[PDB]
Every structure is written in structure tokens, then in C-alpha cells.
Amino acid sequence: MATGDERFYAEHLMPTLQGLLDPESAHRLAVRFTSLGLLPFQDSDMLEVRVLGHKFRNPVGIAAGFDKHGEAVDGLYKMGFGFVEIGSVTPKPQEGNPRPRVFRLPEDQAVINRYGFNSHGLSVVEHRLRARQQKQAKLTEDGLPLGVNLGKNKTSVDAAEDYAEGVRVLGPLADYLVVNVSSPNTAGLGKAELRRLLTKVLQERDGLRRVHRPAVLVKIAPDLTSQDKEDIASVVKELGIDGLIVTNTTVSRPAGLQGALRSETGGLSGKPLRDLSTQTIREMYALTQGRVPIIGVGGVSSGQDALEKIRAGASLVQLYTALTFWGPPVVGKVKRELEALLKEQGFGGVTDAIGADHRR
Numbered sequence: 369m370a371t372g373d374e375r376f377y378a379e380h381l382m383p384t385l386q387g388l389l390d391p392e393s394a395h396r397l398a399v400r401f402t403s404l405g406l407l408p409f410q411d412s413d414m415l416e417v418r419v420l421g422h423k424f425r426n427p428v429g430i431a432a433g434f435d436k437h438g439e440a441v442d443g444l445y446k447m448g449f450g451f452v453e454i455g456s457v458t459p460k461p462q463e464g465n466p467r468p469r470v471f472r473l474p475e476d477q478a479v480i481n482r483y484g485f486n487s488h489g490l491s492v493v494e495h496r497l498r499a500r501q502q503k504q505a506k507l508t509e510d511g512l513p514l515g516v517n518l519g520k521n522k523t524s525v526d527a528a529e530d531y532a533e534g535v536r537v538l539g540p541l542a543d544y545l546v547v548n549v550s551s552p553n554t555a556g557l558g559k560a561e562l563r564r565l566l567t568k569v570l571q572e573r574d575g576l577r578r579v580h581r582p583a584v585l586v587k588i589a590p591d592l593t594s595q596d597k598e599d600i601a602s603v604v605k606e607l608g609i610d611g612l613i614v615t616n617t618t619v620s621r622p623a624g625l626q627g628a629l630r631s632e633t634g635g636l637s638g639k640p641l642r643d644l645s646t647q648t649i650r651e652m653y654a655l656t657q658g659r660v661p662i663i664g665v666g667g668v669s670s671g672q673d674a675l676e677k678i679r680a681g682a683s684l685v686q687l688y689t690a691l692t693f694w695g696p697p698v699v700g701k702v703k704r705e706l707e708a709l710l711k712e713q714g715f716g717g718v719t720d721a722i723g724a725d726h727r728r
């Protein structure tokens with residue numbers, strides 16, 4: 369419990385917790401324990417990455433959706449993540465979907481969720497981040513940046529204005545902001561319309577004072593058509609979007625899922641998403657000519673999984689579902705395995721491996 373023993377968590381503690389608790393209850397408990405620092409690897413120079421205007425001490429981040437309301441940021445750095453992304457946060461508070469809304473697929477090492485952007489709202493999260501704003505400035509300077517993922521309310525009549533409000537309220541507190549094209553669990557969340565939305569978002573970001581001006585990334589689904597991907601790549605290049613987060617959960621249900629709950633509505637995460645996500649990274653890296661930083665996300669639970677996404681074009685990776693199965697020790701596991709594989713494959717560090725598959 370205190371050592372951080374990978375086997376004890378993976379074989380005993382986490383499975384026991386999952387047998388006692390429904391997944392939303394376990395999620396809530398995890399956020400509470402993490403926020404108190406009740407947690408069980410030394411980052412080497414090989415893992416440092418410079419992207420998005422920032423130093424990242426290691427390339428392994430916690431994906432959006434774990435700390436939706438910015439309650440456990442410091443605990444997540446204590447867990448060993450190189451960067452933390454909170455959210456999604458919506459402008460007004462909203463409850464999200466009725467419970468149950470989170471479903472485990474243990475036989476698939478996967479989860480399906482339909483949280484529906486449950487959020488404390490911008491004002492609450494703003495005041496929470498302001499309470500530790502200088503602590504975060506020091507963490508960022510130390511190579512531990514903070515991302516904020518912005519969502520839209522269910523009953524909003526103007527999606528672009530919801531995102532613009534997010535930029536104005538939490539932009540000044542973030543190293544990067546994220547706008548999803550891609551929750552599966554809201555509404556209808558042409559190319560001119562993404563262009564319209566992102567133009568407004570970037571105008572709002574550009575209007576912030578320079579020390580308070582975050583990078584802006586777009587987070588995309590794994591379920592896009594070839595046309596959608598080409599169009600996104602074009603708009604990102606046209607507008608100078610700073611980066612992409614690839615990918616959110618999938619609304620597909622790959623052949624072979626075994627879990628009893630496989631036909632629940634929602635986004636699927638974890639192992640069944642992994643290679644769909646890696647392939648989407650590969651495609652977006654090629655379409656953007658390797659000039660647009662990608663954060664690769666979807667089914668990362670080992671160093672091999674991380675390095676496959678880096679070699680496909682990711683500069684940084686995130687994980688979430690692996691934490692739910694294997695617990696806090698998975699972060700150091702991924703970092704240790706990634707360092708070993710980098711050495712084994714002749715890379716001087718992470719930076720040298722970014723996009724390496726495209727050069728072979």
C-alpha cells in the first residue's frame with residue numbers, strides 16, 4: 369500500500385476494490401484519496417520533452433475525465449504524472465446523466481462511460497485553481513504543466529460561446545486548453561463550422577495577457593471519417609492550432625469484446641481502443657506533416673503502448689483506464705518500461721522517438 373508495489377495493486381488491491389464498489393463510487397474514492405495525497409521512480413533526463421511552449425519532466429499525463437473538477441491536481445503530480453489535465457469543465461454546473469453511467473468490462477480491460485459532462489462549472493473550478501495558482505506556476509516552471517479541458521453545457525444554445533467563456537475564465541490559469549470535437553455523450557458535440565468555432569476560441573485566447581495565454585489543443589474522436597480527419601488537419605494548419613489530443617473514447621464496439629456490459633451506451637476506453645487510437649495518431653501526424661504536437665491517448669498501460677504512440681507521432685501520452693485497473697503504481701511502471709525501450713531501440717530520449725515510424 370505504501371511501497372507502490374505494482375503486483376500488489378494489480379493482483380490484489382485494485383481487483384478487491386472493484387469487487388466492493390461500483391465504478392463511479394470507486395472513481396469518487398480515488399479522487400478523494402488522491403486529493404489527500406494518500407498514495408503508494410525517478411524521472412531521468414531521457415524522458416524530458418519540450419513542447420507547447422513548456423518543459424515536461426516526463427511524457428506521461430493523466431487524461432481528462434479523472435479529475436473533472438480540479439480537486440486532485442497536486443496528488444496527481446505526486447503519483448508521478450508529468451502533466452495533469454483536468455475537466456471537462458462546462459460553463460455552468462450540471463449534473464450529467466443519470467446513474468448508473470459508468471460500466472466496467474473486466475474481461476476486456478476496458479470501461480464504458482456516459483457521464484455526460486458532470487461538472488462543478490467554471491466558477492467553482494476557477495476559484496479552486498486560483499487557490500493554488502502560484503503553486504502551479506512553480507510546478508509548471510519545474511516541468512509539470514497543467515491542462516484544462518473545456519466542455520459545453522447540455523442546454524447551451526451557442527456552443528462556440530460556451531468554449532469562449534471557458535477560454536476567458538480558465539485560460540489564464542492553464543498552460544494549455546483543450547476543446548473536444550469529441551465526447552460521445554453530448555448532443556451533436558461542416559469544416560467551416562469547426563473553422564468558425566476554433567477561430568472564435570483562438571481570438572479569445574489571443575486576447576489574454578501574455579503570461580496568461582495558454583496553448584490551445586483540439587481533442588478528437590477515434591471514430592472520424594477520412595474526410596473528417598483531412599478537414600481537421602486542414603483547419604488546424606490554417607488557424608495555427610497549437611496541438612491535437614488523439615483520441616477520446618470510441619462509440620464503436622470492436623469485434624471481440626467479452627464483457628457482459630459491452631452494449632451499454634457510452635464511450636469505450638482501455639485496451640480495445642488502444643490501436644484505433646495509435647492509428648489515428650499516425651494519420652493525424654502525417655496529415656499535419658509532423659508540425660503539430662500530438663498528445664496520444666487511448667489504451668496506454670505499458671511502456672510499449674506509450675512508445676508505440678510516440679513512434680506514431682505523439683510528443684506526449686496520457687492514460688486513464690489503466691489507472692483504474694492497475695492503480696497508482698502503473699505510472700512508474702509505464703515510465704520505467706518506456707525508458708528501457710527507448711534505450712533498447714537506440715533512442716537518446718523521448719524527443720528522438722517522436723514520429724520515428726514515419727522516417728523508416
Ligand SMILES: Cc1cc2nc3c(=O)[nH]c(=O)nc-3n(C[C@H](O)[C@H](O)[C@H](O)COP(=O)(O)O)c2cc1C
Nearest residue numbers: 431432433455456481616637638666667687688689
Ligand atoms: C470515466 C471516464 C471519463 C472521461 N471523461 C472525459 C472528459 O470529461 N473529457 C475528455 O476530454 N475525456 C474524457 N474521457 C476520455 C479520456 O480522457 C481518454 O481520452 C480516453 O479514456 C482514452 O484513454 P484511456 O484508454 O487511457 O482511458 C473520459 C474517460 C473515462 C474512462
Ligand SMILES: Cc1c(-c2ccc(-c3ccccc3)cc2)nc2ccc(F)cc2c1C(=O)O
Nearest residue numbers: 386390391394395398401402406407470691692
Ligand atoms: C478502481 C477504479 C478507480 C481507482 C483509481 C485509483 C485508485 C487509487 C488507489 C490508491 C490511491 C489513490 C488512488 C482507486 C480506484 N478509478 C476509477 C475511475 C473511473 C472509473 F470509471 C472507474 C474507476 C475504478 C473502477 O474500475 O472501479
Ligand SMILES: CCCCCCCCCC[N+](C)(C)[O-]
Nearest residue numbers: 369370397398401406407408
Ligand atoms: C482509494 C482507496 C485505495 C485504498 C488503499 C489506498 C492505499 C493507501 C496508501 C498508503 N500510503 C499513503 C501510506 O502510502
Ligand SMILES: O=C(O)c1cc(=O)[nH]c(=O)[nH]1
Nearest residue numbers: 483484485551553617635
Ligand atoms: O463526461 C463524459 O461523458 C465524457 C466526456 C468525454 O469527453 N469523453 C468520455 O468518454 N466521457
